[PDB]
Amino acid sequence: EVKLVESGGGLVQPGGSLSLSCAASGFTFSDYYMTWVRQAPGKAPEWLALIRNKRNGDTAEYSASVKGRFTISRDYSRSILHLQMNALRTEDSATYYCVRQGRGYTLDYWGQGTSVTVSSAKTTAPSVYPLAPVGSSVTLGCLVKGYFPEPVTLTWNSGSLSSGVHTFPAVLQSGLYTLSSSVTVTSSTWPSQSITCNVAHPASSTKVDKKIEP
Amino acid sequence: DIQMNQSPSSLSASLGDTISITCRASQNINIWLSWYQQKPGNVPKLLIYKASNLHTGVPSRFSGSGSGTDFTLIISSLQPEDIATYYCLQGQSYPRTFGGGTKLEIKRGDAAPTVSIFPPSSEQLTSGGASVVCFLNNFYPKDINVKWKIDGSERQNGVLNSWTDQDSKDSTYSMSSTLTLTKDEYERHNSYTCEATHKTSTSPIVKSFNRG
Missing domain, CATH: 2.60.40.10 (Immunoglobulins)
Incomplete structure (x- = not known):
């Protein structure tokens, strides 16, 4: 079956460069036009570039937003799609997708995506603070502050406690991100039982547990 | 185009x-x-x-x-x-x-938000490192207003807000609001209040605590 796997994303300075690549499999690479599409959090997808195949000139098309800065190319000998990203700007930050164009000029199959962050801010481990109340039901929380870049992963009781949870999207304040999560349980559930907050931040090898104590 | x-x-x-x-x-x-x-x-x-x-x-x-x-x-x-x-x-x-x-x-059906307020953790307070959190949870419809008061006075400076997508289980929305102060300023005040203004009432839902 058709599969696309992109790679080469990460944190890069403004004005810097990044080389993205897409591994295509399960289909004949040379038979299809290929494209790159990106999506910023809470935005509509944005088509970036298309490259034709050998039978049709191997020529390319670009959106005005990346024209001149991004270059799309293909390696037939390895069925790899490339996107050379130069003179990057903060608003280029998004998830980049390798996407195939099928019959009827249709972008049918998408890749998992590779994340790109363009910022001057530097990588930073999060802090992670437990949030205990000041009956019937009680609301606990977990505050993850001062990290960069995205993302982090937060769970309650290693993922066993998944009900009554509200995990809020990360918000930038400089500089550094802030993320929070709340969990609401029966009053007889806590603190009689142990509820712990698990945070992981790969970009800093952070892996921390914070128990909510009354 | x-x-x-x-x-x-x-x-x-x-x-x-x-x-x-x-x-x-x-x-x-x-x-x-x-x-x-x-x-x-x-x-x-x-x-x-x-x-x-x-x-x-x-x-x-x-x-x-x-x-x-x-x-x-x-x-x-x-x-x-x-x-x-x-x-x-x-x-x-x-x-x-x-x-x-x-x-x-x-x-x-319309739902009023469940409000919980949280003083800075002791860890953040050592230091320093002062953030007050307030959860406005499980409310409907989408729109909602949050107001912070420190010893009565409205505070908007170091406020950070975040919103969840519609909950898949109960179809409600939630909001997190974090007020970050310096340890010094946090300890010069006593009363910290989180006020939620939702469609379900002309009167805001107030949650607070004393001491800082």
């Missing part, structure tokens, strides 16, 4: 409903129009191609139609897994352009 105008930017409906999403191209694009579904946290999936052709793995409750400049996506008998954002895409001319998208939400 062809502009794609997608109406119902947001659409509130009930499970089992029949709903329709529209796509108007600023230029004739023949049959070169496709529809996509994107669940939160997931990648867009192809639903309809060539305006009216159902993609291989797509249920029959999804149908599309239209030619030229006007296109419509119809979802008959809306299901829970159908709750998502939908985009149209023209594939006739370059640049390729998407519609603005349509975000589906489920209708439900």
Whole structure:
């Protein structure tokens, strides 16, 4: 079956460069036009570039937003799609997708995506603070502050406690991100039982547990 | 450049409903129009191609139609897994352009937010390192207002707000608000209050604590 796997994303300075690549499999690479599409959090997808195949000139098309800065190319000998990203700007930050164009000029199959962050801010481990109340039901929380870049992963009781949870999207304040999560349980559930907050931040090898104590 | 105008930017409906999403191209694009579904946290999936052709793995409750400049996506008998954002895409001319998208939400009875306030943790207080958090949870409809007061006085400076997508379990919305102070300023004050103003009342819901 058709599969696309992109790679080469990460944190890069403004004005810097990044080389993205897409591994295509399960289909004949040379038979299809290929494209790159990106999506910023809470935005509509944005088509970036298309490259034709050998039978049709191997020529390319670009959106005005990346024209001149991004270059799309293909390696037939390895069925790899490339996107050379130069003179990057903060608003280029998004998830980049390798996407195939099928019959009827249709972008049918998408890749998992590779994340790109363009910022001057530097990588930073999060802090992670437990949030205990000041009956019937009680609301606990977990505050993850001062990290960069995205993302982090937060769970309650290693993922066993998944009900009554509200995990809020990360918000930038400089500089550094802030993320929070709340969990609401029966009053007889806590603190009689142990509820712990698990945070992981790969970009800093952070892996921390914070128990909510009354 | 062809502009794609997608109406119902947001659409509130009930499970089992029949709903329709529209796509108007600023230029004739023949049959070169496709529809996509994107669940939160997931990648867009192809639903309809060539305006009216159902993609291989797509249920029959999804149908599309239209030619030229006007296109419509119809979802008959809306299901829970159908709750998502939908985009149209023209594939006739370059640049390729998407519609603005349509975000589906489920209708439900109005709900007031459950408010909880949290003083800075001792850890952050060592230091320093002072953040006060307030959760406005499980309320409906979407819109909501938060106000911070320190010893009575309105504070907006170091406030950070975040909002969740519609909860899949109870169809409600939630909000997190964090007020960050310096350890020094936090300890010069006593009263910290979180005020939520929701549609369900002209009177704000107030939560607070004393000492800092």
